[PDB]
Design a protein around this nucleic acid. Structure first.
Lengths: 201, 153, 303
DNA sequence: ACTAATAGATTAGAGCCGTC
RNA sequence: UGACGGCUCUAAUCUAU
């Protein structure tokens, strides 16, 4: 390198404004208050927050969800006699600001169940959409079938690629975290398939 | 958010107060901070433990061009860089033949063969440091590839 | 079966510098696969390659390839990594392995502590208050003997968030002149940002301070001279957060980046982790192979 | 009594892979 | 274990139904 740039090793760095886009997804809107429904016998005491159509979590003697009590009439048709005023409502802005401190539920604790209602919410979406999934070791990747999308590409960029006989699919595994602020921890992963329609075991 | 601070890179000292941020570029021209006059080295290994090291012992003070100097800077040699000498002299080749390494290699118990191959090598080094006079500095245990590829956790 | 850790565990009594070398990595041309090609393309990187096995041999022989000149006086870069002892019967306890950096650039090391009240196999990775005064005072005394006074501050680097049950026991042995700050290095945080134009990752040294306590320092990334980043894809910036104590997070980024160029076993532009803990866990795995060693605050020319 | 609890957000670990 | 990456694949823990 001409005696290592004439034995100087220049910085070779320029100072210009560069815009860098991250891998996160920012928050815009959220429900004004989340509801801690008090079902008691209304919800079977043996089975708790594992089958409801909408994302719901259980805490103490109460069920917490972003929907209303009358929104689970199919899987649990018993909820038509519930009296709605026992449901506990808590505005979200109070939890984030730290002013929410009740013996019923704590502030740092309350920030943990909402992300559960979030991190489990997206998997209900791509099920309705034309997106399939693969169960990763620690997360749940979501990939697109080979040939399901038109002309093998979407927006003139690759989504299914050819590697010899096998194929690869770009799969994202998003998560909900609230450390800097409410964000969607969208991560860039990739998984392969044996022939584009069957996965490599 | 719409911000990204760039923090400064510190510079490491070198010979007679030289400050270059990079290590390889600042050492291929300016030399190490401290001076030692020679490397007293020893080689312990199989029959090829010397010869492969021997072909490489003199191959480091001899310059070898890099494919791309910008990414991988040139190196002129051990003597031209480290202000010292690294050659084949004063070496004490311990003869751990493949037959003695093999009677310890082919052991059913993994915990025994990792201990046995340690004791067979460790004792031969401390003895040279105890019942001998050769002042050693760095010991180059040339473990055969058949060992670390098989005797692996 | 990692007898290389067993190699240098039984040599600590005699303190013999050693360098485990391989026929495969020294005769790469001789070693080929079944398809007529070498198993490891090796001599195309014959730059830093010969540097590493020489500068380490230089280091194992007592050489000093470089130093540090941008370090304050009265500052210790403590870095401790807890290592499981599964080599023994149970991992119910986990040994720690810390180290210390001086103002003189002499990166030392010392054996850490064992987890006595270690909650089950893998607890929160924290030393007990009864032995909390052991590690810090030993590190402070090690600095005290060669400087004459306790340091103005210590930066306890770790991959584990510290808790109050050990920091309260830290205080009564720390003089008030020591700013006992604790900086947790966590690569697990999945921050990632790109470049809209160009197939190059972002420059190493970029940082994003989220709040007055935490930050994200890109110790690995694109470089100003080598023109090729020290990575393939965009890496996770190292999450630096002042766990306890008051300090300037901007000034902290001086220290984290500074302890990445110096790695006295390799010749690379920088390290993706602070060597105050990259070197610290370089003794934990060796010292966990055998538990019958009482070792002093040794140097790195033996491990 | 705990019997276990499903999840946050953490931890060390072994793996092969590339090492323009 | 040249040495630097990087995630994969596993495993474990405390804070609360």
């Amino acid at each position: 390198l001409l005696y290592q740039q004439i034995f100087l090793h220049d910085k070779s760095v320029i100072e210009k404004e560069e815009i860098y886009d991250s891998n996160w997804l920012s928050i815009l809107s959220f429900p004004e208050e989340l509801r801690f429904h008090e079902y008691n016998w209304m919800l079977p005491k043996r089975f708790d927050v594992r089958e409801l159509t909408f994302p719901a979590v259980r805490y103490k003697n109460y069920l917490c969800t972003f929907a209303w009590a009358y929104d689970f009439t199919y899987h649990l048709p018993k909820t038509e006699t519930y009296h709605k005023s026992k449901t506990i409502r808590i505005p979200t802005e109070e939890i984030l600001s730290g002013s929410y401190d009740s013996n019923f539920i704590r502030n740092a604790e309350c920030k943990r169940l909402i992300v559960q209602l979030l991190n489990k919410a997206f998997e209900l979406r791509m099920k309705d959409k034309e997106v399939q999934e693969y169960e990763m070791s620690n997360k749940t990747a979501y990939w697109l079938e080979k040939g399901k999308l038109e002309k093998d590409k979407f927006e003139k960029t690759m989504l299914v690629g050819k590697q010899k006989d096998k194929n690869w699919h770009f799969a994202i595994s998003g998560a909900s975290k609230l450390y800097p602020f409410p964000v969607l921890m969208i991560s860039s992963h990739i998984f392969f398939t044996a022939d584009g329609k069957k996965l490599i075991d | 958010m719409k911000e990204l601070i760039y923090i400064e890179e510190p510079k490491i000292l070198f010979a007679h107060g030289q400050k270059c941020t990079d290590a390889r570029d600042g050492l291929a021209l300016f030399g190490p901070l401290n001076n030692l006059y020679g490397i007293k080295s020893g080689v312990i290994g199989t029959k090829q433990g010397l010869k492969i090291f021997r072909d490489y012992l003199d191959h480091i003070q001899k310059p070898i061009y890099n494919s791309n100097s910008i990414t991988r800077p040139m190196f002129p040699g051990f003597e031209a860089v480290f202000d010292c000498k690294w050659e084949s002299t004063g070496i004490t080749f311990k003869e751990v033949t493949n037959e003695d390494i093999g009677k310890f290699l082919y052991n059913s118990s993994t915990h025994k063969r990792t201990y046995d191959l340690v004791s067979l090598f460790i004792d031969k080094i401390i003895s040279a440091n105890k019942n001998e006079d050769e002042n050693v500095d760095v010991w180059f245990v040339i473990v055969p590839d058949e060992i670390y590829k098989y005797c692996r956790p | 079966a990692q007898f290389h850790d067993q190699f240098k565990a039984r040599l600590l009594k005699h303190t013999i510098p050693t360098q485990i070398f391989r026929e495969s990595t020294l005769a790469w041309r001789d070693f080929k696969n079944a398809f007529g090609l070498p198993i490891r393309d090796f001599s195309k990187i014959e730059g830093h390659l010969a540097w590493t096995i020489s500068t380490a041999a230089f280091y194992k022989a007592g050489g000093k390839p470089w130093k540090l000149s941008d370090v304050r006086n009265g500052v210790c870069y403590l870095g401790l990594v807890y290592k499981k002892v599964e080599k023994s019967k149970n991992p119910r306890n986990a040994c720690c392995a810390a180290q210390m950096f001086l103002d003189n650039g002499d990166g030392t090391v010392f054996k850490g502590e064992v987890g006595p009240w270690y909650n089950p196999k893998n607890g929160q990775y924290h030393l007990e208050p009864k032995e909390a005064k052991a590690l810090l005072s030993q590190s402070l005394q090690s600095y005290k003997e060669q400087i004459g006074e306790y340091p103005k501050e210590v930066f306890i680097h770790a991959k584990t968030r510290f808790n109050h049950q050990e920091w309260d026991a830290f205080l009564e042995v720390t003089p008030k002149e020591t700013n006992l700050v604790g900086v947790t290095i966590s690569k697990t945080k999945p921050l990632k940002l790109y470049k809209t134009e160009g197939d190059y990752t972002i420059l190493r040294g970029n940082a994003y301070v989220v709040n007055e306590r935490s930050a994200f320092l890109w110790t690995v990334g694109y470089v100003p001279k080598i023109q090729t980043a020290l990575s393939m894809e965009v890496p996770n910036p190292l999450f630096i957060e002042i766990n306890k104590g008051e300090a300037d997070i901007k000034q902290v980024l001086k220290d984290i980046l500074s302890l990445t160029k110096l790695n006295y076993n390799a010749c690379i532009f920088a390290d993706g982790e602070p060597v105050t803990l990259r070197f610290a866990d370089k003794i934990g795995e060796i010292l966990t192979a055998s538990t019958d060693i009482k070792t002093p605050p040794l140097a790195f020319k033996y491990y």
